[PDB]
Amino acid sequence: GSHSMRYFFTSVSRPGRGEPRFIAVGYVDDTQFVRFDSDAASQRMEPRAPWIEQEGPEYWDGETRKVKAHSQTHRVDLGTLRGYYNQSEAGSHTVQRMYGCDVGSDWRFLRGYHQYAYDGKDYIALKEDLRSWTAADMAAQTTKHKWEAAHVAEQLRAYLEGTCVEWLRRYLENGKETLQRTDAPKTHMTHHAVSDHEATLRCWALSFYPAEITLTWQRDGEDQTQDTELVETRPAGDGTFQKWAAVVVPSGQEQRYTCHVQHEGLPKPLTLRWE
């Protein structure tokens, strides 16, 4: 039902090996649709989904212009942050920015977000009211004062509530066959002895979209969360996702264990059994 548009930006300094590397990517839900890489030959915002290709030359020129502007800002930010934290030129550092908007099943605005990290830790984030900031440390308080005096929140709020949601709706419509689909997981469990006395039970979900899924093991109905190995949801490469969860159990107890799968494509949650 619900949908998101998100843009992800990463800038990495490269001490004495030239200017920072900048990578930008845009997603609708779990489907990438655009990229920019400062190191690439094209110097253009590039399509990465079939349904964005129909956008006109004004779109591509304007997105290239804007993404290059973001690239330059983040270049400046890396120097600013070195100053704020009194850091040297010896080391590489990383700035990350994420922003975007969520809509409900009825495609009306739910929430907006606009967040920044420096060296993998939260730096500054727009609050859920889109009017105020959370600054994670003293350096980010300096940014907060500057952004408050410059009325940055008001500019972002108008984008996140208006433009962001309008373009997300357009993408959802244009990319309807890709984006407004739900592929339910194809599920099974595998069994393999690891010794004469223990077996690995692995619960699989394959070929699903969107990526959000829950897989859990129970023993006589009790959740086995501390004993479960759960891997990160991974892309198949074809637009669908995969995930597994495993437990190692004593041989003969298989029938006590059940796997439980929750996904929006399922008419009901599934319970998989060894009997």
Partner: peptide
């Protein structure tokens, strides 16, 4: 569609 305004840290 990207945001079109710039803001420095």
């Amino acid at each position: 569609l990207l945001y079109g305004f710039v803001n420095y840290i």
